[PDB]
Amino acid sequence: CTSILYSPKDHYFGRNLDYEIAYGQKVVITPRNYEFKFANLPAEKSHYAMIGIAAVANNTPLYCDAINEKGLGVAGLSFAGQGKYFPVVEDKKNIASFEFISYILATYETVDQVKENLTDVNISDVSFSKNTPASELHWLVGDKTGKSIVVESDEKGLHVYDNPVNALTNAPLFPQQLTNLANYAAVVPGQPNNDFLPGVDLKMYSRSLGTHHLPGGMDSESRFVKVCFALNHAPKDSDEVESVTNFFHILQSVEQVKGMDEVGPNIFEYTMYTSCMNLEKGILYFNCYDDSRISAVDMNKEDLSSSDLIVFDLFKKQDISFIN
Amino acid sequence: CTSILYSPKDHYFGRNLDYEIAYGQKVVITPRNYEFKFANLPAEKSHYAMIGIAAVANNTPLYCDAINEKGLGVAGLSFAGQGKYFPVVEDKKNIASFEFISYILATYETVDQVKENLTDVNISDVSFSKNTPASELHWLVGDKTGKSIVVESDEKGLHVYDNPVNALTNAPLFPQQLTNLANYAAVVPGQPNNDFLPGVDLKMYSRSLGTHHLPGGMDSESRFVKVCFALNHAPKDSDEVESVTNFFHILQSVEQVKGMDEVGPNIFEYTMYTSCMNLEKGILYFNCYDDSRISAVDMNKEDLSSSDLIVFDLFKKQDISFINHHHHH
Amino acid sequence: CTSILYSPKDHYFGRNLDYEIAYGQKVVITPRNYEFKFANLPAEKSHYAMIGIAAVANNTPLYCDAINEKGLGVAGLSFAGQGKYFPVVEDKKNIASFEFISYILATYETVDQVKENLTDVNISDVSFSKNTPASELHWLVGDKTGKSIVVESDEKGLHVYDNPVNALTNAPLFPQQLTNLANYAAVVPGQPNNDFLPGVDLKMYSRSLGTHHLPGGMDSESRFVKVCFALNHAPKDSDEVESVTNFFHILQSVEQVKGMDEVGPNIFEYTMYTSCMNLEKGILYFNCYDDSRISAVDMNKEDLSSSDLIVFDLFKKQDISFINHHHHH
Amino acid sequence: CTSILYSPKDHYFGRNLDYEIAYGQKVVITPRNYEFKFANLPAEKSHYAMIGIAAVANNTPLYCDAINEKGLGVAGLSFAGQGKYFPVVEDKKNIASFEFISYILATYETVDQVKENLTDVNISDVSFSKNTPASELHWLVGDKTGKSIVVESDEKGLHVYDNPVNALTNAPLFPQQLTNLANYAAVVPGQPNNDFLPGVDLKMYSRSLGTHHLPGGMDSESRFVKVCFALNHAPKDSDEVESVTNFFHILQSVEQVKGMDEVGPNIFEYTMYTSCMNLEKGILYFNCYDDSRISAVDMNKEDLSSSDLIVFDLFKKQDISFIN
C-alpha cells in the first residue's frame, strides 16, 4: 500500500490497498450518532461523521482509510516487522490500533489538533476480538492545509513526524524513508545536462533519461520514492474532475499487477482498490482491480444525524461501455 | 509508447500511446471494399477489413495500431533518432512508412506470412503530403500464434527480428533492447535467497525485495524492461473480461503520468490512450488519460462489405458512476 | 571513511582514510608509560601500549585508527550531520571525542569488555584546543574474536550496536545502513538463474551479471554495501603476506580516486592512506595515495616500556622498482 | 579486461588483465630486427621495436598489450560470445588474431594510419598451434594525439570505431557500450541540484550523492561506465610520477578482487596484473595481484637493433618495506 495527500486546489486524500486477500471491505459512512464503544476510552454517542473504506464486523466499522466532515483524513498501512504496541497503562490515553482511525476522525478536525493530542497517547495491544488479532499498522494523517503527519508506534514508543512529501508506504521507519529520498536527488523528468563526462557528446537516445534510475519495484521503498516523484510533479490548479483523474494516475504509477509481487507459492499481492477522498466536499471516489470505471459516494447526500452505518459496495465487475 | 501481445487464452494486441500532443486519433474501421491507393504499389479495392486507432486525412486512415479480421495486428511506435527511410527503388517492393500498417493488414494473415514477404521490401521515404513529413517509426507485428516480430528500418537497411518477449517500446535498436534484459536476470517477483552476504542474516523488511532493482523510469529502456516483466508474469487461462482487465493493468505498469516525462520546456509526454484488441474476435477495447472506464467497439457488428470508413470517438470525458444519487426511480 | 575487520586466520583491522584536508598524520606508537591526561577522567600513567595513525599536537597522540598490544582495535570515521556530543555531566563517565580511541585502547582488551563499560558513558563536547574543535565521529571497535561493534553518539544519546558485517563508513545511522543491505539480497558473484523472464533465453553476455547492481559510487552508502560484499567473499585460511595483500585489495575496491568525489570548487575527497593492522602480532601495514608499496612497522620491536611517543613517517613518495638498470653488480 | 588511454601531459596506455587462468605472461621487448613470421603476410626482418606484456612460445611473443617506439599502443581484451574470425580470403590483408598487436605495432605509427590501413583487412581464424586455439578478442588502439579507436570483428565483419571515451572492456558490441553510457548522464562527482522534489528540503547526508548510481559491479558494462568516469575526471597537467600514480588509481577503481567474480565452482576472475605504458618515453610500469609496488622497464635502455626477445619477470611476491 501507498497513501497520498494531493493539493492541486481542493485537497484529496487516499490510497492504493495492495494485498493478496480481501477483508470484506465496503464503502461505509458512519453518521454523527453512531455510538463508538472504544476499548479503554469513554464512549462517544455524538461526534463527527466520516466516510471511508471499512470492514464491518459486529456492527462496527474497522476503517482502512477515511475522512471526516471537517476535512481530516487518516489511512492505515501495514507496518509488519517494524511496529510495536504496548499494554494499557494508567498514565496515558490508550487507543487500540484497530480503532485509531475511528477515534481520531470522530474527535478532531486538523493535523495540528492531532499533533497536540497525541503527546499523551499510547497505542495499546488490545485486539478487536479473539478471532481478529491486531495487525501491525502505521498511519498517514492529512487535512485541508495540505500538510500531513506520520504516526508510528515502534520499539522506542510512539512517534509523530511531519511529512514533507505527503506520502507513505510500508517499512522501514519513516526517518529512514525520508533519508533514502536524497539518494534520488539527481533524478529529473527531462534530460540532465552532461556533467557526467564533460567534453564527450553522449547520444541522448531516449526521452526522459533523467528518470532512468527512478525505482519501479513493488517493494515498499521503491513505491515510496516513485510516488513522491509522481505526486510532486503532478498538475496543479485543476477543478474537480481533472483533479480526481490525476489523483488516480499518481497512484497507478505504483500499482501492483497480479504476478509481479509474489508473497507465497502462486500467491500475489496486487492493488485491490484505490480510494480518493475530497476533503472539502466529503466525496469518496473509488475503483478496484476488476473495475477501472471511477465510482463516487457523497457523504452529504445522506442523513448525517442518523445512527446506523450506511454501506455501499466497493468491489465491482468490469463496467465496459459498449459503443456499437 | 509501449506495445504488447498477450496470450492468456484468446490473444490481445495493443499499446499505450504516450506523447505531448494528439493527432486527431479516433477509432476507425476500414471495410473490405475501401480502396487503398498505395504510393508505389497496385491499388487494392478488395482486401481484409481492419479496426484500430487512426488519424483521418483526406478520407485516408493513417493508423497508429490496428488488427485485421484474420487475427494479425500491427502497431507503429516512434523510432526517432534510430530509423532511416530510403528512396523508392525499382528492385524492391516499396512501402511508405505511413501506409505500412494498412498495407500489411490489408494483405496478410500471419506473422510467418509477413516475415516471408518482407524479404524484398524497402520502407520508402515518401510522405503522406508535401506538408506532412513522415514520422520515424518501427513496428510490432503479432498474431494468434502468440508470436511476434519487430520490423526496423535503420542505417543498415530493413531488419526483421523474432520477438521472444512480445513487447516493444522506442530506441535503441531491438538487439540492444534484448541484450539489456540480461542485466535484470536476478529480478524475482518474491524474495531472493541470500547469496549476497552468506552467513549474515539480512532481515527481509519489505515484500518483493526481488523487484528492488526493477526499472520504473519513463525512458524507453526502463519501460521495455518493466513491461516485459509484467507481461511475462500476468495471469493465464482467463475468460474475455478478465483477460482485458489484466491487459490494461500490464500497460498501466508503465503508464506516464503528467509531469513525469519532460520533453520540452514545461511540455510533458503522458499516456494519452490505451488500446487492447482481441485478435480472435475483432473487438477493440480502449480508454484514455481523461476516462478510465473501458469502452469497446466490435468490428463484426458493422457492414464489412462497404467501402466507407466507419469512425467512433476515442477521447472521452471522465465517466463517473455516482452511486448515491437518491433519484428514487 | 571505510573501516573493516578481516578474519581469514589471523585478524586484521584497518581503514581507508578519504578526505580533502590532511592533519599531519604519522605512524605513532604510544608506549605503556606515556601519561594520558584525559580531559575529565583520572590520568593513566601505566596502560596498554598501542600503535596506529595519529596526529601529534603538544605531545599528545590524536588517533584516527589504532590497535593495542592485546588485540583490540578502534577506528574513527566522519559522522558529520548525524552525530551529537553532549556537555560534561556528573552522572556519567565523560570521554572526549578526540580521546575516545586512546582511552578505549589504553584500558580494555576485548569488544565484550568495551560493550560492558560503555553503559554509563557520555561522549563529551570538549575539544582538544581552541584551534582544534571536535570533529564529529563515530567508531568501529573490533578484536581477535572476529566480532565488532559500532559506537555512535547522536541526537538520542550514545548507542552501541553489534556489527554483523564487520564494516563501517559514514552516514546514515548504523541501523539504517544495515537495513539498506537487504536491498542487495539478490546480488551474487556469479550468474543468476533466470527467474526474471521464465521461458525466455537471456544471453548472459558478460561474466558476473550477478553484480550488475552492486554500488560503485563514492558516497557513504555505496561504499558500505560494496565493501561488505568484498569483505564477505574475500579468501580465507591464508598466511600473513597473502592475508595482508587481500586486505588491501578489499579496501582498494572502494577507494576514492582524485576527481570522482568533489567537495568544493576543484577540491576533491580522495583516499589519503590505507592502514592494515594485525591484531595478534601488533604490526601496522600502510600505503598512501602517492606510494602504492606497502610499508610495515612492528610495535613489538620497540621499547614498549618507555614513555615517549615513537613516530614514523606515513606519507611517502612513489617507490618504484626500476628493473633493467644495467648496473651489472 | 579494462583498457584506457590517459592524456594528462604525456600519454599513458595500459590495462588491467582480469582472468582465472594464467598464460605465462612476462614483460617482453621485441627489438627492431627480430623477424616476424606472419601467417599470410610477408616476413618483416626490420620494423619498429615494441615493449609490452606477452606470453612467449616457440620464440614468438604473443602480446596482451604493448606500445611501439613511435608512440602507438594496442591492447587485446576478451570478446567471447561477440567476436567472429573468418577464413583466409584472397581479396584482403589477412591478419591472424594472435598476431594483430604484433603486426600493427611493427608497421604503423599513428591511429590515423591504422584507420587508413584496416579498410582492406580481414581478421583470420588462423590459430597459433593445436594447443593454443585462437581466443576471441577485440582491440583498443591509441596514440600520442590522445585519440583512440576500437577494432571489432563480429558476425557482420570488421568494424573500426572512433572511441570518444578512450576506454574499452568486454561485451557487448562497442556502439551498444556507448549507448549505455547515456543512461548515466545524470551522474556528477559532487552534489546534484534538487530538481527531483522541488520545494522539498532533501538533506544531503553524504558527500558525492551525485555518484550514488555509478556502477561498481564486476561485469563488463559496469566496469566500462565507471572507468570512463574515473578517466574523464582524473587530474591533468601532471609530471611523470604523479601521472603514473593517478593511472594506477583509475584502474584500481574497477579492479576485481578475488571472490567477487565467480566463473566456476570456487573459481574466480581477478585482476592479475596492471600495466601502464608511457607512449612518449617507452617505459612500461606494472604491478600484479600479489605485489602492489610498481616496477618499471625502460625500452630505450636496451639495444633495440638486436634480434632476440628481451624478457623480464612480471609476476612477483609482495615487496613490503620493513621500517623498524
Ligand SMILES: *CC(=O)CC[C@@H](C)[C@H]1CC[C@H]2[C@@H]3CC[C@@H]4C[C@H](O)CC[C@]4(C)[C@H]3CC[C@]12C
Ligand atoms: C498494503 C498494506 O499495507 C496492507 C494493509 C492491509 C493488510 C491492512 C490495511 C488496514 C487493515 C485493517 C484495519 C481494520 C482492522 C484492524 C484489525 O486490527 C485487524 C483487521 C482489520 C480489518 C485490518 C485488516 C488488514 C488491513 C486491511
Ligand SMILES: *CC(=O)CC[C@@H](C)[C@H]1CC[C@H]2[C@@H]3CC[C@@H]4C[C@H](O)CC[C@]4(C)[C@H]3CC[C@]12C
Ligand atoms: C509513443 C510514441 O512512440 C509516439 C508515437 C506517435 C507520436 C506516433 C505513432 C503513430 C504516428 C502516426 C502514424 C500515422 C501517420 C504517419 C504520418 O507519417 C504522420 C502522421 C501520423 C498520424 C503519425 C503521427 C505520429 C504518431 C501518432
Ligand SMILES: *CC(=O)CC[C@@H](C)[C@H]1CC[C@H]2[C@@H]3CC[C@@H]4C[C@H](O)CC[C@]4(C)[C@H]3CC[C@]12C
Ligand atoms: C570520510 C571520513 O570518515 C574522514 C574522517 C577524517 C576527516 C577524521 C578521522 C579521524 C579524525 C581525527 C581524529 C583525531 C583528532 C580529533 C580532533 O577533534 C580533531 C583533529 C583530529 C586530528 C581529527 C581530524 C579529522 C579526522 C582525520
Ligand SMILES: *CC(=O)CC[C@@H](C)[C@H]1CC[C@H]2[C@@H]3CC[C@@H]4C[C@H](O)CC[C@]4(C)[C@H]3CC[C@]12C
Ligand atoms: C577480461 C579479459 O579481457 C581477459 C582477456 C585475456 C583472457 C586474454 C587477453 C590477451 C590474450 C592472449 C593474447 C596472446 C595469445 C593469443 C592466442 O590466440 C591465445 C593465447 C594468448 C596468450 C591469449 C590468451 C588470452 C588473453 C590473455
Ligand code: NI
Ligand atoms: Ni437517475
